[PDB]
Amino acid sequence: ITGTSTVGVGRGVLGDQKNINTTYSTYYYLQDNTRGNGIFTYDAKYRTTLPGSLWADADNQFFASYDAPAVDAHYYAGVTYDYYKNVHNRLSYDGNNAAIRSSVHYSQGYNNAFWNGSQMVYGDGDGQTFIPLSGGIDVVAHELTHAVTDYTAGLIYQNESGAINEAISDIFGTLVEFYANKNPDWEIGEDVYTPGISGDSLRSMSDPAKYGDPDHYSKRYTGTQDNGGVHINSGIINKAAYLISQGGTHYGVSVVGIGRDKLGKIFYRALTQYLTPTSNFSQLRAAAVQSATDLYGSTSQEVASVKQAFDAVGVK
């Protein structure tokens, strides 16, 4: 909407206070004009029609329990926008400052979040498996990264290309979490997953097997569930990414870590310059080796480490 840019204040899902960019025109709307062509957050009102209504508030204060998922969707979209712009010189998901839209309070007891081809969508969870999913910065960045992938490599959402698609979202979700620097880790969704159980998460990049996800190509799932295991086989690539950044010895193969910033540069270049809609794991290895070669040189430690990491997870 047309209005004047303002700054509201509220509390997120975990009870933390934060400032949010809003727009005033009769009401205060969750419309952040400070980033690209805007970040817009909508209320789906427990229904499934999208996007719903642009979030409107009478007083620019967002401290109601019902407000919390909107506060976090809006704020963490901003953080993710900043990450891509400041770190990768990418302006929004399309590279041309496309408006970023999110809807919260989607459906009832909805234990998931997704990119629907045009916008991000967040369930509130059922209070047992999840609390409102926008409370996780890694989750928000995971979802916006699906949009980045769709506008770039275009990895088809099934089988190996789909597992790469998933891993790319977990990787950048995690790198954004580190960028914001609040309780960062290599786990996925820990902030909003199972409020009754401490210390767990939906997936782990450092040890995917803790939740029965594969950490070696020999253990890949080849059935039909979950689009051919896109959220399962992502473990193989997530493990490789973790090893590239942090190092380690995995099934006897030692990897020299090169750090998160270089992981991010290598995988962003692979995603945007080399991967295609049908890339498989072997092709991702080649893309990452080439990307590291472009950035650091053929004889670099960085190139050697990428190779070590893919060797370690059994991808040739």
Ligand SMILES: CNC(=O)[C@H](CC(C)C)NP(=O)(O)CNC(=O)OCc1ccccc1
């Ligand atoms: C199991 N879910 C997840 O891993 C994450 C949420 C996680 C980070 C909390 N959500 P996601 O974005 O991977 C779920 N997406 C999904 O199932 O895609 C189906 C689809 C939905 C709409 C259009 C096309 C395809």
Ligand SMILES: [Ca+2]
């Ligand atoms: Ca209010």
Ligand SMILES: [Ca+2]
């Ligand atoms: Ca964390």
Ligand SMILES: [Ca+2]
């Ligand atoms: Ca995390």
Ligand SMILES: [Ca+2]
């Ligand atoms: Ca938990």
Ligand SMILES: [Zn+2]
């Ligand atoms: Zn995903």
